Amino acid sequence: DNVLRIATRQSPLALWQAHYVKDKLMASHPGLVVELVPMVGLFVKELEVALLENRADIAVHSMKDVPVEFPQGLGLVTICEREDPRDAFVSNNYDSLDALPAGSIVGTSSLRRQCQLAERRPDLIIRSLRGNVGTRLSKLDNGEYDAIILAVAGLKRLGLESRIRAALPPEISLPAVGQGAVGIECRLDDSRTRELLAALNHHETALRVTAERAMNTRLEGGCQVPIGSYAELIDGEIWLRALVGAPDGSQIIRGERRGAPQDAEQMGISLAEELLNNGAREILAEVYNGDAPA
Numbered sequence: 603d604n605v606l607r608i609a610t611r612q613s614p615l616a617l618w619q620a621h622y623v624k625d626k627l628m629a630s631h632p633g634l635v636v637e638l639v640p641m642v643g644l645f646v647k648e649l650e651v652a653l654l655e656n657r658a659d660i661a662v663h664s665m666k667d668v669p670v671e672f673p674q675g676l677g678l679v680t681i682c683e684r685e686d687p688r689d690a691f692v693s694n695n696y697d698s699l700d701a702l703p704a705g706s707i708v709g710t711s712s713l714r715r716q717c718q719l720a721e722r723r724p725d726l727i728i729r730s731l732r733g734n735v736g737t738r739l740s741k742l743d744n745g746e747y748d749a750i751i752l753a754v755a756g757l758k759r760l761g762l763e764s765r766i767r768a769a770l771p772p773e774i775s776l777p778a779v780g781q782g783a784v785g786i787e788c789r790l791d792d793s794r795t796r797e798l799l800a801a802l803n804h805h806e807t808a809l810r811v812t813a814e815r816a817m818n819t820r821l822e823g824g825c826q827v828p829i830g831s832y833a834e835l836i837d838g839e840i841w842l843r844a845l846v847g848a849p850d851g852s853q854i855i856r857g858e859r860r861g862a863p864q865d866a867e868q869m870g871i872s873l874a875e876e877l878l879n880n881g882a883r884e885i886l887a888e889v890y891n892g893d894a895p896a
């Protein structure tokens with residue numbers, strides 16, 4: 603077949619990523635007919651059902667939303683070129699985090715962003731914030747939050763880069779696994795589709811996210827977990843940093859690992875176990891409601 607059906611969420615951002623993949627596909631294969639099959643973790647389960655019942659051929663996600671476990675037959679096969687993986691500080695009245703006076707309300711529902719925020723500034727009020735980027739920016743403007751933390755990649759792709767007051771360095775707010783990268787899921791036995799996707803995969807980014815995901819997989823993580831996992835390719839080696847923290851910032855467990863690109867997965871697993879054997883297991887047990895990594 604020459605038709606390629608892309609399943610995707612229906613938010614402005616999700617549709618941006620869908621177009622991104624489509625464009626890349628069209629450029630590598632001028633004869634391919636790409637159809638979008640948008641549809642309303644729960645933010646991935648419906649797309650996976652579409653894949654299993656042949657209503658779509660591939661599903662485009664933001665890497666950090668991709669779960670660590672896949673139903674048999676499905677899997678991640680392509681990881682596209684990574685964008686700015688950093689968190690961004692967005693605010694209208696203030697220019698930085700240090701500038702926020704005591705009692706300021708920062709919005710984010712990410713435990714990863716919160717635990718790190720609270721570790722440095724116990725005086726701030728971290729308040730939950732949910733919805734598409736557009737609604738989040740709306741609530742900020744309505745005055746419900748003094749500031750909010752969002753990813754740099756999302757704002758840039760939406761052309762809302764001017765919203766970024768300051769990009770928070772990884773040392774301050776360690777990025778979520780795969781933040782800034784787009785990943786494509788599809789049926790493992792679908793050779794044709796996989797062959798078409800080969801041109802979109804970005805080796806270096808795949809190296810980094812693999813180390814990040816291996817770490818997360820061992821910890822049995824996801825979005826609702828206070829886990830940071832970020833890798834860089836430094837002078838031919840992968841530098842992996844990871845953290846697990848208590849949502850109140852009182853206890854944050856940190857570790858790092860460095861090694862050859864081909865050991866990306868084992869480095870991830872090793873670092874994860876190191877965190878686990880150092881208390882991460884007790885913290886994660888809270889967040890998981892009894893459940894804790896093996």
Ligand SMILES: *Cc1[nH]c(Cc2[nH]cc(CCC(=O)O)c2CC(=O)O)c(CCC(=O)O)c1CC(=O)O
Pocket residue numbers: 664665666667710711712713714715731732751752753754755756778780781782783824825826
């Ligand atoms: C795992 C997780 N997902 C989200 C929501 C989300 N998913 C993708 C993006 C855009 C950035 C990207 O594609 O890399 C976003 C929104 C964003 O981060 O700007 C979150 C955010 C929850 C929140 O802040 O309320 C998370 C949790 C996490 O990042 O740790």
